[PDB]
Amino acid sequence: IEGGWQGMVDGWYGYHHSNEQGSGYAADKESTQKAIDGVTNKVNSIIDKMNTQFEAVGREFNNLERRIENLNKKMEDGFLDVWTYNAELLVLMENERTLDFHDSNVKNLYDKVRLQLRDNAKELGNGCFEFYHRCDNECMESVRN
């Protein structure tokens, strides 16, 4: 596609139809419903996955316990770095998977409509289809349903 449309604010994915009667946007509720559930499932799983990470504890050492004090400091900083890496890296993995998940849904919706009207339509290229037999509002819905 050239880009996304600001027009529709119903859902995330959807159709736009041109027709002898008129024209307007129409969001796919089936696609948007499964998408909203998918992302909300992930954001919660990232919270649960990290919930058994290291919890640091104040310890006190005297001035002839400098070696162990240092060991303690290096140990706590060590884990805090390790989990900060895991946290940061996990977010980049979740983010990347979110954006690819959206681009996956666009193509899957374009292929779903194309498979539904094989010889009865012509794929232009820019993410649109020209009907061979004319298609009123009821047929548009029938393609959407």
Binding site: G4, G14, Y15, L99, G127
Partner: protein
Amino acid sequence: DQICIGYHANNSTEQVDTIMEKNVTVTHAQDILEKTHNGKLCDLDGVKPLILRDCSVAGWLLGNPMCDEFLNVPEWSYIVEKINPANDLCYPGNFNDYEELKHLLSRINHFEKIQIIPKSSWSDHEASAGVSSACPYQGRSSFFRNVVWLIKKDNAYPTIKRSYNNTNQEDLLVLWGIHHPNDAAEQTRLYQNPTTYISVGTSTLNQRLVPKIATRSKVNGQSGRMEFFWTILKPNDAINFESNGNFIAPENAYKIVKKGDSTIMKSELEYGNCNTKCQTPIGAINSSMPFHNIHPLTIGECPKYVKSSRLVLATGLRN
């Protein structure tokens, strides 16, 4: 007649990162890192912390006269001590195994102080002359409240033999000390007997201390030193002191009344008259976020600490 597939968009400028790409603008983005704290020390789930203010744990437990505020404290959620408390050991010296005691204290939520050896119990020794200008109270020489600096009476210091049997159900923190004088003259002036010792026994403890006379630098105007010791006297055990000099006897001891999760927090902040679920030494946190970067040392139901400055999830599509 025609139909087209497309996706949502808007005028948002919020951006996120990816392993592949950086600075990528999207429609919606969920921040998951808490960066803000309230900047004060609060009650933890409705339980007020013990704020020691200018006193140290040692000063509190031994009863430094400047710390009279904490003679009988109520239950606490956590303890707050400054980085370098002014009111510590007023009479110079050291607390033996002090960091270990502080570790026990971080498992404790409430003491009940009781007197185990009354100050009037000492018939053959002077219990009231044991005071120093190093420990002032209301403009006069005083001393630690919870322990007694015994000295000779009528130029005599007869051998002490005292026992206390812990008849309580609680573990009992008992404290005592030894005085290291400056010279042989001071030794005999205070305690008569030139060569002295302190024996202390329990079912587990087998101590024998001897004073260490030496010329030391003046600290709070004193070249003498006092060294303090502690022990946990289990229910039904007894502690037996024997000494012919230099003994800093117990007067009060602490019944361990409640244990639980607590900590000794180092912070320069004062009580804030607030309540929270999550405290750091730098301030409290009220947040639904899974992560935070305020401070690593925390107590309560807190988010997970990280060192990251920024942490933002993608929710919805790119522009």
